[PDB]
Amino acid sequence: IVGGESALPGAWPWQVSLHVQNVHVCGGSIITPEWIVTAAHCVEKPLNNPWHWTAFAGILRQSFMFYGAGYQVEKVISHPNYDSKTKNNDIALMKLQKPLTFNDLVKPVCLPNPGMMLQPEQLCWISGWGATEEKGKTSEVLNAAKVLLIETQRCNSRYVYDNLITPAMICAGFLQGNVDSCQGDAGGPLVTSKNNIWWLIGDTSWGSGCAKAYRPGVYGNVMVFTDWIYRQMRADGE
């Protein structure tokens, strides 16, 4: 995260660090004791083998993420309409082999419902262990920052992203920059507060640079992917 501050324990209990070969690569968001929402570009082949992924919950520092403190990922499900060139439908689910234990440090975030009636520039939060500056290294501590929703019509302007933002994507951040997700935040949560409840409205997807002017962050529209998520969890219960 560029432009954020260090996060406290329990501030973001759904945030998880996803390690491939015990190195942090992407973030995720807990929705059920055994399901985690993340980005599909994080798990492109050959990184689709669920045996390679371990998830760390409730831990705020990367050096405290010893092997064995993480949970073994059992299954990885990329969106079947995911396009790697346009980053369209950049959403993926991960199932844990053993369910988490919820407490003040590990809690799920609510999946969004239809008719949320969000504001055009609704105040949101992003979080993750991504770099704090462009072309930086994975941050040690969990960071979080305030971003505002950017109307897709404005984000699709010829001066921002020329009709590259699809209905499966939403924009957040600032058209002046300074605050944005970055390298290592992919799959991380984009959450807002309404009715005293935190909702997962986006997963960190793509963008041009980090916190640059006219280049806000693009996130997967989790509301659009809501039907697909429910269908996947419904099938695993079997």
Binding site: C110, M116, W199, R231
Partner: protein, 138 residues
Amino acid sequence: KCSNSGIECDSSGTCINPSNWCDGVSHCPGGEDENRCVRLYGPNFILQVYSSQRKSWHPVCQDDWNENYGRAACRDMGYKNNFYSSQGIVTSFMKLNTSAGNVDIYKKLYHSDACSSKAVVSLRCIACGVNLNDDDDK
């Protein structure tokens, strides 16, 4: 992709009749027509069920509604045995046919015009959305 043909199954553009959506029998190739028939609406978690006779979403009457029915709606949405809260809350509705048998949950309800309890069903299938309550700084 199914405007002049029906409702898109999302199974590579296959279309079926809107009357066959959430009608109990699986027509779509992947059953997409019979697995997303129950949802939660708005920031107040208003329980809704898609009716096939009317081809639209409608809230649920609190008449004879209990916890087991809410857990059956949560299993239908993919939350498995998870359940958190359920209560009544303040025009086409879905009254609850008690003698419906061992049928899908969204079929245990029939369309009506009013609920005798005056309240619709609010449902939360999992305890989520709670974090650190920040500070008291002005």
